[PDB]
Amino acid sequence: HHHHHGCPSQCSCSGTDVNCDGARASVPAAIPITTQRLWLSNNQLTKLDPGVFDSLTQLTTLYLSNNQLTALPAGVFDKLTQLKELGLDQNQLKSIPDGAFARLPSLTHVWLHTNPWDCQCTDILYLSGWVAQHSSIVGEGWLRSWTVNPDNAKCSGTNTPVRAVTEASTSPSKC
């Protein structure tokens, strides 16, 4: 269509890219269901509505980096089965809900660094096992600077890698 495109206010859209980075506290409504790449980085997010992404089944890239996310809701990524890139770095996450990445078989780039992962608490063990089993996709940087480095998901206060934590060192009382 001549000089006509199909976009959330304060975001910029082109093709199936939706750039909502840096608009500032909640995920905008009416992100098109055909969206393949979604930037939600550099906003004010401290939580997500459960189900917020459930209609965006064609997503291949999702950036949530550099928010202040304190927790993710269980199942929040369950519908994003075509996701290849998932950015969660530079947030305030202490653990990942059990099973959160289980339905994401196509991941090739995952960013988890610069979060205060709480490795003494029982709830770290899903993430510890996941990183240990998917080490070749956990990294840092972008394009020319992309480098895999699974030890950059680090335990707050000791800087030990999250993937080295096993059940016998954790305690429910530290949650």
Residue numbers in the entry: -5 to 0, 2 to 19, 21 to 171
Sentences copied from the publication:
As antigen receptors, the lamprey utilize a family of highly diverse proteins called variable lymphocyte receptors (VLRs), which contain multiple, tandem leucine-rich repeat (LRR) motifs. The resulting VLRB protein is a 15–25 kDa, crescent-shaped protein with a continuous beta sheet where its concave surface forms the antigen binding site. Herein, we report on the characterization of a lamprey VLRB that is specific for terminal 3-O-SGal, and was isolated from a lamprey immunized with human type O erythrocytes. This VLRB, termed O6, is the first reagent to our knowledge that specifically recognizes the 3-O-SGal determinant on glycoproteins with high sensitivity. To better understand the molecular determinants of glycan recognition, we determined crystal structures of unliganded (apo) O6 and a co-crystal structure of O6 in complex with (3 S)Galβ1-4GlcNAc. This O6 VLR is relatively small compared to other characterized VLRBs, containing 178 amino acids (~19.2 kDa) and only a single LRR variable domain (LRRV1) along with the other usual LRR and CP components (LRRNT, LRR1, LRRVe, CP, and LRRCT).
The sulfate group of the ligand forms hydrogen bonds with Gln86, His109, and the backbone amide of Gly137 in an identical manner to a phosphate ion in the apo structure. Comparison of the apo and glycan complexes shows no movement of the C-terminal loop and only small changes in residue rotamers (including Trp138), indicating that the VLR is preconfigured for glycan binding (RMSD 0.28 Å for 172 aligned residues).
